[PDB]
Amino acid sequence: LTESSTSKFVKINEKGFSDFNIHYNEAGNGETVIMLHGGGPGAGGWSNYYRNVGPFVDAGYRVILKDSPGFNKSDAVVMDEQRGLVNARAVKGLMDALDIDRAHLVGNAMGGATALNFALEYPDRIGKLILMGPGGLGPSMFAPMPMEGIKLLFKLYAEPSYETLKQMLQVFLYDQSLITEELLQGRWEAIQRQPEHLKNFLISAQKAPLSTWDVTARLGEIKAKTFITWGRDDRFVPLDHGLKLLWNIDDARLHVFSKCGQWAQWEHADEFNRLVIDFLRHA
Amino acid sequence: LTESSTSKFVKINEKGFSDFNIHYNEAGNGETVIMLHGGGPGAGGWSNYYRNVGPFVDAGYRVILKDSPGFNKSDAVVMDEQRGLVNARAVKGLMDALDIDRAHLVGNAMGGATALNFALEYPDRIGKLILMGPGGLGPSMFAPMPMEGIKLLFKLYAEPSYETLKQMLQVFLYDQSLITEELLQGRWEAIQRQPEHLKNFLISAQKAPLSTWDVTARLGEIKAKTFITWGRDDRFVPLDHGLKLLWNIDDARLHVFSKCGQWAQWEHADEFNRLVIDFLRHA
Amino acid sequence: LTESSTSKFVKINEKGFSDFNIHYNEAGNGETVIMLHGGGPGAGGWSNYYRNVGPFVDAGYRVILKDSPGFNKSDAVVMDEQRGLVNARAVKGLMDALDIDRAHLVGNAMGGATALNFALEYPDRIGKLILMGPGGLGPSMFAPMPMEGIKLLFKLYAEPSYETLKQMLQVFLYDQSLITEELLQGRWEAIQRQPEHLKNFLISAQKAPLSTWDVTARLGEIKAKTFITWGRDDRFVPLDHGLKLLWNIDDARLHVFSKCGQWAQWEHADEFNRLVIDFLRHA
Amino acid sequence: LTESSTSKFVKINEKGFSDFNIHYNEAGNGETVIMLHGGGPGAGGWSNYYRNVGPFVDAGYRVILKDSPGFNKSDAVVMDEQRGLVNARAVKGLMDALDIDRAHLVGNAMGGATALNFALEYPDRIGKLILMGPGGLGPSMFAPMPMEGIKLLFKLYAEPSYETLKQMLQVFLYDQSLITEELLQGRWEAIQRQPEHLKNFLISAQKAPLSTWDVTARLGEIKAKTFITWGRDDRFVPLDHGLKLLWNIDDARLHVFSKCGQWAQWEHADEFNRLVIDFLRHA
Structure with a gap:
């Protein structure tokens, strides 16, 4: 499975969204699991979850790696409400558009905020x-x-550079040897391809600071049933937010991995895949 | 599988132990997993782990539920060293006696202290x-x-009563409706059958208080590789000791169960069994 | 200064309260500091704060040790709202009745909840x-x-006894040698004198459980400016609620005393008095 | 009181130190309080504690602001043991040289490590x-x-620059408006004046990493008696290290200040001065 072969677009219509273009990567055909990415510059569905899509599809799920509004190949947007809520409306928009009644949600960082808001709304x-x-x-605390x-x-949103990209990834990951040229060029390309997104995120963060996300x-x-x-x-x-x-x-x-930064699904992919598949099957 | 059909005794000889009688319950014949119980009055291998022995044996392991020295049907003893260390020597004693080169250890509370000391020594x-x-x-902290x-x-060690037994179990378990007459009579019988043990635990705790257990x-x-x-x-x-x-x-x-007291393997047996079997197979 | 010589009553009229009798102990004549006690059976202003009233009056403050509604010699009451809020209305009632424009508040446990609600309302x-x-x-967390x-x-509210009183105080205090016969007889007398209060607290806790207090x-x-x-x-x-x-x-x-239970103002009176007086004078 | 008027040097002889030059700033003549600074590039006694020396001397203490070995105007040194221990030996060296039998110690960060080691040794x-x-x-945790x-x-030790100095101070302080040109030029001058120190700290940190400081x-x-x-x-x-x-x-x-970075004695000088003087006088 590749980014191109799984790539799709759908137009959504929900609350503020009027024929808004959402990009996603889809594989498999069983019960739907939608995976939602973090909010750093260059983030997107495929690059966040490409180590998880195969094992999940093999387990019999239909996996949708969603690009959130204002990221990757989804439409540009300036948000005046907290991103978690606006993202959740887009997930619902996507699910209505595709005739999906119910979905399991997987969410990292911003995508976790999105998943929480979806479950509430x-x-x-x-x-x-x-x-x-x-x-x-x-x-x-x-x-x-x-x-x-x-x-x-x-910092990377305001002053995008390759060197600042590298500094950020060095903080996001525990194991520094995971920071290959492939990883860096990937994120860098996503940043270069759509500068509008970076600008719009900073404007959005002015209208609705992180303090307004607190649900x-x-x-x-x-x-x-929830697996943290x-x-x-x-x-x-x-x-302590896990507690x-x-x-x-x-x-x-709650499951905490040692030697692990913000991308558990990437840094500890095998154990993550096993634990979440087991949970979706048996909890 | 029952307590009687799995019941065995072996005499151990390690450090302080000279032909010391250890009771255990054994089933299965694959790689050995030794399970070690907590330190409350009436505790023992079978009553602590009877919801785990079957699923583990079904997964292909040889399960040994060990009675620690001074508990259940293992010999009476007064210890002058921290119990974790003395218990660990008994596990080694048991493994030498049975020609077991290596074992996976599962340990709750006192049994966790025992397992830590074994791994160190x-x-x-x-x-x-x-x-x-x-x-x-x-x-x-x-x-x-x-x-x-x-x-x-x-309190229960010093003044054993059925009412105090019940009060203790009400604190040990989150879900109070799990405290059946069967559970109470079980622990009560183990207490009544060997009063020497209660007396000896209190003497042992004077010679080596809990502060001396800190490894x-x-x-x-x-x-x-460790699963907490x-x-x-x-x-x-x-x-915070998990952290x-x-x-x-x-x-x-680290895996933390919600709505769960000190007996995770009993209060959340299905999820516990799945997580630990998965870990023994794949980590 | 004694309980009798400082003892006063005032009738309050605020929201739900109609000519409701509030007992308090007052000494000094400078700026008003109102001290508010915890919620355990037998609690009251004087017995909670008698080690603080003198040093505070010596520092130049007017100290009011308030009996909260449904405690000690204040009127009996059954509350259908969270106690913190109802108590805070009584403090305002008291302050209107006595022509006090502004007060410094000191609050322990339930009295801390009361003080928080007062500051909010x-x-x-x-x-x-x-x-x-x-x-x-x-x-x-x-x-x-x-x-x-x-x-x-x-437990003490539902089944009042001298032995259960003693068990509670053994948990409330770090240093057990502080539990004198004077302390025990004091609380015991307050419990015996007004059994209506114990009954009413339990009814109130049914209408508005502790979960409804969360502000x-x-x-x-x-x-x-706040000193925790x-x-x-x-x-x-x-x-962690301090954090x-x-x-x-x-x-x-935030100031945390070592070797100290729930009554810092009593168990560490000298240091407490110095720190809070310094704060009222200079922060 | 100024840096120049209080400035003194003494040669110390203790364990590894042979006629080793220690710079300090001294004022007052009552009981000795020695104040010990942190370990960042450019740190020293006067610049760390100039807001505390006056109020402490006014309270009747003799204040000694000590430059630790390998900082400011104390001699250059390469350490092969954990800095806390080596620093503590220097404090003793200083106290023997000046006929000081006993001292109160105040220690920030590295200086806290130094103070702990002194109290132990x-x-x-x-x-x-x-x-x-x-x-x-x-x-x-x-x-x-x-x-x-x-x-x-x-980073600042390895690549000293004015811009990196500023970035560090922005992290060390909560209130950014405290970062004046005076503060920056001060630290910058201390860095420029003795580049040997920066080099030697990095060599020392190789021989004895921070993990070796743990007492x-x-x-x-x-x-x-200890005030944290x-x-x-x-x-x-x-x-959590405070806990x-x-x-x-x-x-x-334990006393925790809100809106406060690593320099409590500078960022909250008035409250800090009051609390520690009160503690030295009355605890």
């Missing part, structure tokens, strides 16, 4: 909920904020 | 290490000590 | 805010709930 | 112990390591 449309260091859950990785994310107070409403994952060494979203979800969501469990 | 003799709220790892469950454990400083020596589990609602050993192990053991991961 | 009427292990601030001390508080989401509104204190060894309200306040209140600081 | 020679975010106390501020400290296991030996301070927003040493000290030192208390 559309409880009838979600199956299980897999959350990987979800962003925007308010203050940490230990970590000064903005987090180190968040400052680097904003902590509503976590008690989530009835979806964290990287022990995540410098982007703090580890926060575990205490506040009715039916949750 | 006999690194050549352990496979993987599964730790469920291991006891004795020093102070908590949050929890006042002695913990609520520890005070109840000492934190040596955690860097463990090269065994915790109950979110454990009132016996504090949750402590995760930060200090080279190759560890 | 009547920001124009508060000076500085001193919070000692305030209750009701939602879940802990570490501590299973209900906390050990909370279970003992409810976390509004902490950003507090503009009062905690006992390291508090088994009633969890230590929660410190992160969420604009101008806060 | 020379318990007869210390009065009270004031610790401000002490470095080297092992892993954090929450914070990935090396900490953000530590990476910036090593956690010996904290139970400290009988000095932390900045809530410290990105150099993690907040670690509070749990493990016999007689400790």
